[PDB]
Structure 1
């Protein structure tokens, strides 16, 4: 009974849900997985792409909850 979410990557729809994570007070893979009801691995990939963009620093790794933070 898994829900149906829009996962297709489009010229328009792709750039409408990727800029909605930082619009929340509590922004963690746990909060996103319990509230927005999409895989937490997608949120982990999103924060990995943010780390690739160079605005944060990776500290440690885990299969569920990873550590990515900043000191600036």
Structure 2
């Protein structure tokens, strides 16, 4: 029984902005499993981190979105 959240709380936003950019592979599935968030929230958080420039993009596709860290 998944209890994935659909909206971040401020602490989880801080962890998304700090610990997540330290992840090697960044895809919506990994973020959903780790941060305990929905896949929609995962995709949107990945887009925001791509807006703040805290990640790179290795490959984008409809089925699989693959992102990695710039640092």
- Normalising to structure 2: TM-score of the pair? 0.52
CA distance in 1, matches of 2:56, 2:23: 21
> Which structure shows the higher helix fraction?
2
Alignment of 1:38-57 (within 5 A): 38-57=37-56
Partner of 1:16: 11
Of structures 1 and 2, the one scoring higher in RCO (CA 8 A, sep 6+) is 2
Note the C-alpha offset of 1:64.
4.3
Q: Does 1:32 align with 2:27?
A: no
Unaligned 5+ segments in structure 2 are: none
Note the C-alpha offset of 1:55.
2.6
Unaligned 5+ segments in structure 1 are: 8-12
Question: CA offsets per residue over residues 37-67 of structure 1, 9 Å max, x none?
Answer: x322211211211111123322321234312
Aligned length: 66
CA 1:51/1:39 → structure 2, altered by over 3 Å: closer, same or farther? same
